[PDB]
Write an enzyme that holds these catalytic residues in place. Structure first.
Site, mmCIF file in Angstrom:
data_model
loop_
_atom_site.group_PDB
_atom_site.id
_atom_site.type_symbol
_atom_site.label_atom_id
_atom_site.label_comp_id
_atom_site.label_asym_id
_atom_site.label_seq_id
_atom_site.Cartn_x
_atom_site.Cartn_y
_atom_site.Cartn_z
ATOM 1 N N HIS A 67 23.922 10.681 18.526
ATOM 2 C CA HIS A 67 24.602 11.902 18.933
ATOM 3 C C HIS A 67 25.320 11.741 20.254
ATOM 4 C CE1 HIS A 67 24.877 16.395 19.276
ATOM 5 N NE2 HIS A 67 25.239 15.957 20.467
ATOM 6 N N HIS A 110 19.154 11.110 15.548
ATOM 7 C CA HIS A 110 18.478 11.957 14.598
ATOM 8 C C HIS A 110 18.945 11.671 13.206
ATOM 9 C CE1 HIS A 110 21.966 14.792 14.404
ATOM 10 N NE2 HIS A 110 22.029 14.732 15.717
ATOM 11 N N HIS A 112 20.677 12.469 9.863
ATOM 12 C CA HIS A 112 21.841 13.280 9.563
ATOM 13 C C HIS A 112 22.021 13.374 8.056
ATOM 14 C CE1 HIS A 112 25.328 15.613 10.473
ATOM 15 N NE2 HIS A 112 25.472 15.210 11.713
ATOM 16 N N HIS A 397 25.631 30.236 18.099
ATOM 17 C CA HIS A 397 25.788 28.960 17.392
ATOM 18 C C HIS A 397 26.249 27.857 18.325
ATOM 19 C CE1 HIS A 397 25.372 31.090 13.630
ATOM 20 N NE2 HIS A 397 26.254 31.974 14.064
ATOM 21 N N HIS A 402 31.599 15.412 16.498
ATOM 22 C CA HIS A 402 31.394 13.980 16.559
ATOM 23 C C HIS A 402 32.659 13.257 17.103
ATOM 24 C CE1 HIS A 402 28.055 13.614 13.281
ATOM 25 N NE2 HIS A 402 28.006 14.859 13.719
ATOM 26 N N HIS A 452 30.436 20.938 13.454
ATOM 27 C CA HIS A 452 29.496 21.826 12.800
ATOM 28 C C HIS A 452 28.614 22.511 13.801
ATOM 29 C CE1 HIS A 452 26.056 19.006 13.305
ATOM 30 N NE2 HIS A 452 26.926 18.035 13.090
ATOM 31 N N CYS A 453 27.997 23.616 13.349
ATOM 32 C CA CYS A 453 26.901 24.204 14.105
ATOM 33 C C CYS A 453 25.719 23.249 14.076
ATOM 34 C CB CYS A 453 26.502 25.532 13.478
ATOM 35 S SG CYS A 453 25.164 26.280 14.468
ATOM 36 N N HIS A 454 25.080 23.037 15.224
ATOM 37 C CA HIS A 454 23.948 22.122 15.315
ATOM 38 C C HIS A 454 22.600 22.796 15.086
ATOM 39 C CE1 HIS A 454 22.111 18.272 16.073
ATOM 40 N NE2 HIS A 454 23.240 17.700 16.440
ATOM 41 N N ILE A 455 22.603 24.084 14.690
ATOM 42 C CA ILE A 455 21.393 24.658 14.084
ATOM 43 C C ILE A 455 21.350 24.059 12.681
ATOM 44 C CG2 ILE A 455 20.290 26.749 13.261
ATOM 45 C CD1 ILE A 455 21.715 28.157 15.731
ATOM 46 N N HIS A 458 21.792 25.954 9.554
ATOM 47 C CA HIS A 458 23.147 26.479 9.348
ATOM 48 C C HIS A 458 24.093 25.405 8.812
ATOM 49 C CE1 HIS A 458 22.320 29.792 12.536
ATOM 50 N NE2 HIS A 458 21.480 29.856 11.509
ATOM 51 N N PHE A 463 27.884 25.362 7.428
ATOM 52 C CA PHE A 463 28.666 25.728 8.641
ATOM 53 C C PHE A 463 29.294 24.475 9.281
ATOM 54 C CE2 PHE A 463 28.275 29.181 12.239
ATOM 55 C CZ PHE A 463 29.533 29.661 11.947
HETATM 56 CU CU LIG Z 1 24.611 28.242 13.662
HETATM 57 CU CU LIG Z 2 23.277 15.654 16.958
HETATM 58 CU CU LIG Z 3 27.004 14.158 16.875
HETATM 59 CU CU LIG Z 4 26.712 16.140 13.017
HETATM 60 F F LIG Z 5 27.960 13.186 18.020
#
Ligand SMILES: [Cu+2]
Ligand SMILES: [Cu+2]
Ligand SMILES: [Cu+2]
Ligand SMILES: [Cu+2]
Ligand SMILES: [F-]
Ligand SMILES: *[C@@H]1O[C@H](CO)[C@@H](O[C@@H]2O[C@H](CO)[C@@H](O)[C@H](O)[C@H]2NC(C)=O)[C@H](O)[C@H]1NC(C)=O
Ligand SMILES: *[C@@H]1O[C@H](CO)[C@@H](O[C@@H]2O[C@H](CO)[C@@H](O)[C@H](O)[C@H]2NC(C)=O)[C@H](O)[C@H]1NC(C)=O
Length: 497
Positions: A67, A110, A112, A397, A402, A452-455, A458, A463
């Site tokens: 990330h 993480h 993905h 949100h 990326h 994207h939303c990182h929740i 979601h 999202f």
């Molecule tokens: Cu969200």
């Molecule tokens: Cu991330």
């Molecule tokens: Cu990322």
């Molecule tokens: Cu991502």
């Molecule tokens: F990223």
């Protein structure tokens, strides 16, 4: 006990009990959180990920994203499943071989794939700077100064029932914390400091959902880094940190030798600190081994406000100093209804062929790319503006891009844009109803980059969009290794696709 920049990383199933409740998990390096992956700016990381997963309740496939690392020329190593690769299947491995030129700071890694990172595949990723301009502000910066904030669920991610509200069961600080219900006096994390020294605390949200109000009783915190971007020093006594964000702050061990509560209050789940939930311990060397007796204030004096942050370097803002003053100005319509999120009317559902592979196979406009309506082309060498007006349910949100960081031209809860010196970062809260959080960047990194939303719940519910940046130069910019080319045939064979 940091690993890298060249390392194996095994992904396994195991039972853990970080809050005293045992459940199976998906782990990197056998622990929650996973081990810290580290190196120096400009290093070549070669992370050979071994998928040893056998429990289908948490998915036996995997894919790992690094990330905040730009992956320039290595889009194939970015990790988002069905965007840049097919997943790695069980019993196989894959070498994520990339470089980190021009970046130094606090990152994380993480899963993905689906909501798998919620099941445990999350850990810190630190790129040190041998010539850090902030080096003289602290004495200690090592694995003992990383602070992770995590939400933890008793229900498995794939098993969260359709149509029921999802909230966590514990806040974990450095992997430990107490459950909100049926609380037991399980061990709390201890962060140890020596009176008189100064520490670079690297605060990492590895959250799947909640934001946290982070503070340390008796202490204040001098922010020096935001999502990898060095900042001017900003002293605060509370940090609201959203999913996937990072801060470094200087902690001056300048209070009496003793024990002090570390607090991380999520915006959902258990409220307060009864029984030691939402808590860890800051312990000075020489203090008695006992819980703190400190209290928080009723009202914090100097909470972090994002518009107070400014880059250490003269980063400016690309484009012209007014709304729409970019080569490609966008305004996204971000919505939620009936269990699904959408962007410009399209809910993201991952495609069968990863977007990158579609491009390499010759799909050469974004209208040709699947999922239809979910891939938006960006032109090369251009200033992009993206307005992200809030209002969709489930907020605030934290949107993440990326391949890039970005200038935060407009922040949550403040209608005034900043075209002069806003902070740059990679994950930003889009705020509340009527807000118009807006980001800018320049397109100098060909490839498909997820927005994207990182929740994570979601994201799973749609999202997201993909920015296909500089389609024409994607194949020449991102030569792919044979092992990457082998991923989709192996995955599709295993899944009878
Ligand atoms: Cu969200
Ligand atoms: Cu991330
Ligand atoms: Cu990322
Ligand atoms: Cu991502
Ligand atoms: F990223
Ligand atoms: C957020 O800012 C964007 C611009 O960055 C606004 O976009 C304009 O929207 C109106 C319709 O609402 C259009 O007529 C314009 O063409 C858009 N672009 C401009 C003015 O540059 C958007 O309205 C703002 N949204 C909110 C909720 O404040
Ligand atoms: C709302 O955001 C604006 C823009 O980032 C903030 O305005 C800046 O405030 C600083 C501090 O006084 C000044 O140096 C700048 O000249 C301002 N810039 C602009 C474009 O106005 C403002 O402080 C924020 N509001 C709050 C309450 O924090």
């Amino acid at each position: 006990a940091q690993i890298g920049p060249v390392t194996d990383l095994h992904i396994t199933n195991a039972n853990i009990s970080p809050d005293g409740f045992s459940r199976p998990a998906v782990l990197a390096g056998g622990t929650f959180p996973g081990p810290t992956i580290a190196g120096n700016t400009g290093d070549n990381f070669q992370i050979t990920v071994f998928n040893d997963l056998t429990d289908p309740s948490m998915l036996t496939d995997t894919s790992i994203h690094w990330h905040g690392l730009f992956q320039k020329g290595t889009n194939w190593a970015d990790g988002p499943a069905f965007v840049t690769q097919c997943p790695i299947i069980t019993g196989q491995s894959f070498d994520y071989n990339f470089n980190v030129p021009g970046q130094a700071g606090t990152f994380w890694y993480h899963s993905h794939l689906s909501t798998q990172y919620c099941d445990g595949l999350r850990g810190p990723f630190v790129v040190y700077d041998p010539n850090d301009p902030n080096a003289s502000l602290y004495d200690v910066d090592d694995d003992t100064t990383i602070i992770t904030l995590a939400d933890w669920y008793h229900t498995l991610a794939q098993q969260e029932p359709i149509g029921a509200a999802i909230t966590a069961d514990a806040t974990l600080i450095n992997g430990l914390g107490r459950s909100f219900t049926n609380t037991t006096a399980s061990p709390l994390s201890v962060i140890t400091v020596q009176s008189g020294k100064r520490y670079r605390m690297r605060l990492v949200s590895i959250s799947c959902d909640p934001n946290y109000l982070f503070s340390i009783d008796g202490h204040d915190m001098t922010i020096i880094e935001v999502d990898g971007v060095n900042s001017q020093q900003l002293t605060v006594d509370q940090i609201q940190i959203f999913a996937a964000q990072r801060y470094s702050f200087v902690l001056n061990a300048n209070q009496p030798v003793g024990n002090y509560w570390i607090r991380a209050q999520p915006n959902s789940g258990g409220q307060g600190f009864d029984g030691g939930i939402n808590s860890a311990i800051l312990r000075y060397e020489g203090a008695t081994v006992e819980d703190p007796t400190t209290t928080a204030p009723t009202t914090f004096s100097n909470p972090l406000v994002e518009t107070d942050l400014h880059p250490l370097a003269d980063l400016g803002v690309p484009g012209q100093p007014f709304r729409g003053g970019a080569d490609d100005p966008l305004v996204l319509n971000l919505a939620f209804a009936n269990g699904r999120f959408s962007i410009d009317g399209v809910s993201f559902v991952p495609p069968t062929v990863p977007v990158l592979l579609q491009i390499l196979s010759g799909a050469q406009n974004a209208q040709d790319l699947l999922p239809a309506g979910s891939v938006i082309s960006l032109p090369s060498n251009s200033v992009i503006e993206v307005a992200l007006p809030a209002g969709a349910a489930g907020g605030p949100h934290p949107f993440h891009l990326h391949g890039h960081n970005f200038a935060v031209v407009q922040s949550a809860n403040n209608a005034t844009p900043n075209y002069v010196n806003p902070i740059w970062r990679d994950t930003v809260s889009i705020g509340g109803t009527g807000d118009n959080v807006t980001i800018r960047f320049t397109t100098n990194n060909p490839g498909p980059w997820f927005l994207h939303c990182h929740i994570d719940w979601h994201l799973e519910a749609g999202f997201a969009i993909v920015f296909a940046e500089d389609i024409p130069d994607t194949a020449s910019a991102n030569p792919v290794p044979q092992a990457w080319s082998d991923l989709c045939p192996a995955y599709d064979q295993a899944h009878n696709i």
